Amino acid sequence: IIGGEFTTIENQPWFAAIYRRHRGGSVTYVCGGSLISPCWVISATHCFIDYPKKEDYIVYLGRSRLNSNTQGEMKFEVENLILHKDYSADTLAHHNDIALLKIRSKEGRCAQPSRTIQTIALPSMYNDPQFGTSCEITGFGKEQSTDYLYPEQLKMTVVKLISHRECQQPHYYGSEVTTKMLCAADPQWKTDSCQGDSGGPLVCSLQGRMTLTGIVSWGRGCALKDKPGVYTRVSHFLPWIRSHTK
Ligand SMILES: N=C(N)c1ccc2cc(C(=O)Nc3ccccc3)ccc2c1
């Protein structure tokens, strides 16, 4: 997250921290995710497509720091890694950038909801917030594009949704951004998601309900002028999510 504020997991209790185990035992951070039901975390297929072995992943819920075992956190392995069969990547745009991770503790249990571990509601069909609505993003991604390290403390920021017609303007993304994607950015271009925030949530309060409107997917650079963050439009994928979690 470029700009924004440092936060803790009690403020974003649906946030999942996803890591990967390498040959030799080193563990590195991969992407964010969101808890949609006790056994299911939703994220972005581009985070996993090049390393599709479910055994390599570690998922934490209730974790506030990249290298601390936060009090109350829960650690999980991935029982089922579901990648979207029509996922694809263009030079900038990622398509069907959505994935499901069925999670299990070493005892075979799903998440236990608590003050610091909670689900986030899915959106309803054909009912996303209007352009100009403020939504929040959360993640352990880069603080500056030139950084190679990720921040130790979880961050959040607030951005505004941008219409499809504005996002398809020539100086924005043209025809590369589709109706299955949602743009969101800072009008002053000082805060955004960045590399390492992929898979994480874009949460919008809609009609008084906190909702997982989007999933961090792609963007040209980070916090660049006329280059919004692009998010998978979760409401489009409700049939896919329902069918793949049944
Ligand atoms: N400007 C943004 N909001 C934004 C969002 C997501 C991003 C993802 C990556 C990224 O590294 N994606 C990726 C990583 C590995 C394989 C495929 C895509 C880089 C910059 C981003 C900026």
The domain locations on the chain are 1-12+120-235, 13-119+236-246
CATH class, domain 1-12+120-235, is mainly beta
Structure tokens at 131: 């352009």
The residue assigned the tokens 């916090």 is 223
Structure tokens at 20: 């990967």
Q: Ligand 1 mean position to 221 CA, how many Å? A: 8
**Nearest-atom index, ligand 1, CA of 50:** 16
Residue among 34, 56, 95, 97 flagged as catalytic: 97
Residue 147 DSSP symbol: -
Alpha carbon distance 125, 128 (integer Å)? 8
Structure tokens at 94: 């990622």
Confirm or reject: Cβ of 228 under 6 Å from ligand 1: no
The dihedral region occupied by 62, where left means phi > 0, alpha psi between -120 and 50, and beta the remainder, is left
Q: Ligand 1 mean position to 219 CA, how many Å? A: 6
- Homologous superfamily, domain 13-119+236-246: Trypsin-like serine proteases (2.40.10.10)
Alpha carbon distance 244, 80 (integer Å)? 10
97: annotated active-site residue: yes
Q: What is the dihedral of CA 63, 21, 221, 185, to 10 degrees?
A: -30
Structure tokens at 107: 């005892």
Whether 1-12+120-235 shares its CATH topology with 13-119+236-246 is answered yes
198: annotated active-site residue: yes
Structure tokens at 190: 């000082």
152 and 65 in contact (C-beta within 8 Å)? yes
